[PDB]
Amino acid sequence: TLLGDERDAILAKWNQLQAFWGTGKGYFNNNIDGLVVLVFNKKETEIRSQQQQLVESLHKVLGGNQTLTVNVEGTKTLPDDQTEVVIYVVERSPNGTSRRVPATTLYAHFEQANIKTQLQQLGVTLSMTRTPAQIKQLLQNPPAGVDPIIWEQAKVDNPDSEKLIPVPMVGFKELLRRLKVQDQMTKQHQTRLDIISEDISELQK
Amino acid sequence: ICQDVENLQKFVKEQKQVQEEISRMSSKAMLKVQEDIKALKQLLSLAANG
Amino acid sequence: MDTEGFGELLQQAEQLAAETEGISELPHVERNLQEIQQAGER
Amino acid sequence: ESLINKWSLELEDQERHFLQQATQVNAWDRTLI
Numbered sequence: 611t612l613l614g615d616e617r618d619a620i621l622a623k624w625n626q627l628q629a630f631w632g633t634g635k636g637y638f639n640n641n642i643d644g645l646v647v648l649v650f651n652k653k654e655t656e657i658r659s660q661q662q663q664l665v666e667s668l669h670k671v672l673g674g675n676q677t678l679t680v681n682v683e684g685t686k687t688l689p690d691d692q693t694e695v696v697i698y699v700v701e702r703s704p705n706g707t708s709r710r711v712p713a714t715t716l717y718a719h720f721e722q723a724n725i726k727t728q729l730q731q732l733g734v735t736l737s738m739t740r741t742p743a744q745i746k747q748l749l750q751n752p753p754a755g756v757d758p759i760i761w762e763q764a765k766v767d768n769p770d771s772e773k774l775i776p777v778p779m780v781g782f783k784e785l786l787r788r789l790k791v792q793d794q795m796t797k798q799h800q801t802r803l804d805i806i807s808e809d810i811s812e813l814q815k
Numbered sequence: 816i817c818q819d820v821e822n823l824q825k826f827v828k829e830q831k832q833v834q835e836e837i838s839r840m841s842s843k844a845m846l847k848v849q850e851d852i853k854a855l856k857q858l859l860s861l862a863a864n865g
Numbered sequence: 866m867d868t869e870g871f872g873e874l875l876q877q878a879e880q881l882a883a884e885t886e887g888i889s890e891l892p893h894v895e896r897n898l899q900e901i902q903q904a905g906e907r
Numbered sequence: 908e909s910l911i912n913k914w915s916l917e918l919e920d921q922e923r924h925f926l927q928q929a930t931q932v933n934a935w936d937r938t939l940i
Contacts (some may be wrong), residue, residue, distance in 0.1 A: 611913070617823075620914050624827050633922050641940060746912040771938060782833040782925065788932050789840050795939065796844050800851070807855055813862050814869070821932065827914075834921060835926060845935050854867035861869030865876075 627692055628755050637764040638788060640777035642745055644698040644710035645683060645717040646717060648729075649736040654693040656733065657685055664732070668697065671728050672719075677702050745775060753778045 623632035650657060656766040657664060663693045665680035672678050683696040699711045717739040720729060729737070741748075752761045779788065882892045896904060 616911060616915075619925065620849055620911075620918060621823060621826075623918055624830055632918070636926070638929070638933055638936065721920060745835065779929070782830065782837055784835050785925075785929055785932055786833065786840065788936070792842075792935060792939065793842065793844065796848065799848055801937070802843075803851055807858070810855070810858050810862050814858075822890040827917075831921065834925065842935055845938060849938060850866065858867065861873045864870060864873045 624781075632638045632781065633692070634781040635760070636779055636785075637760075637776055638779045639764075639768055639770065639774040642775040643740070644700075644713050645696055645718060645740050646698070646713060646720065647694055647696045647738045647740075648734050649688075650693040650695060650733045651691065651735050652693055652733045653691050654685060654687045655693060657693050661685075664695075665697065667732055671725055671732075672699065713741050749775050756779065 619630075622629040623634075625631060661682065666674075668680045669678065672680070679700050679702070681698050681700065683698060684694075685696075686694050687704065688694055698713075699716060700708050701711050702708050717737065719725060720737055749765060752758045753802060761778075768774060768776060779785070882895060884892055
């Protein structure tokens with residue numbers, strides 16, 4: 611029956627798997643994350659308890675200088691005693707320019723023997739990383755299960771290549787995704803703008 | 816087969832919920848920003864001219 | 866919007882016209898509109 | 908075929924929408940940078 615395939619196509623359409631994904635396909639351009647996941651032997655709990663320390667703690671493992679800052683993305687519950695903390699670190703430069711430290715030269719740092727030992731004292735049982743030239747490094751070779759000819763074309767189509775790389779976006783929750791980030795993003799913009807505003811008030815006063 | 820339509824419409828609709836969900840979520844926060852940075856830039860010009 | 870420039874300006878110009886001992890710079894009188902346009906023309 | 912019909916048009920209808928929304932967000936991100 612012709613009838614059953616239409617049904618199949620439609621089912622195909624509405625799905626995260628990507629067979630002509632409900633024609634949900636849309637690519638958003640993400641500028642070019644540094645995220646490291648840590649498992650603690652601790653309740654989710656031992657964590658939200660002392661969250662200050664715990665990044666400080668992380669901060670001083672890093673060396674504990676000012677041009678360095680530790681940030682927490684989510685904490686989730688895996689089991690009765692057990693927790694996943696995801697963090698990224700931003701690094702400041704002599705001119706006051708900030709960026710996140712890359713996931714791999716962060717992971718490289720933490721795998722150290724001393725640092726690993728130090729992290730272990732903290733309760734960290736395990737860690738994982740998600741991931742100039744490096745752009746070139748990821749943008750080619752394709753992503754998530756995205757087709758290679760489309761992925762290409764987002765690269766040519768890209769309006770603003772340094773500020774941006776093609777990042778695969780996946781149907782509605784993904785837009786949800788983006789929005790969550792946007793908001794995430796929004797608050798920090800607002801704030802930094804406040805910091806400039808405070809400094810300007812101090813100068814004027 | 817008509818187990819069947821019970822589920823598919825259900826997974827499809829489950830999805831429309833998310834679509835609604837995004838729809839619920841929409842911006843003013845964003846609109847706010849350009850206004851402010853446009854404004855802060857101006858105070859900076861003040862301080863500078865001062 | 867929130868601006869603070871012409872509030873500097875006005876500020877300046879305010880702060881301008883009032884005094885002081887400065888051996889030379891005495892406050893100036895402000896014209897405007899009718900006399901000023903002509904003044905601009907001269 | 909009452910039903911299948913319902914599927915497509917709902918599909919294309921929402922699709923046309925999803926498209927516009929993604930775009931929104933794109934334009935918002937837009938504005939962010």
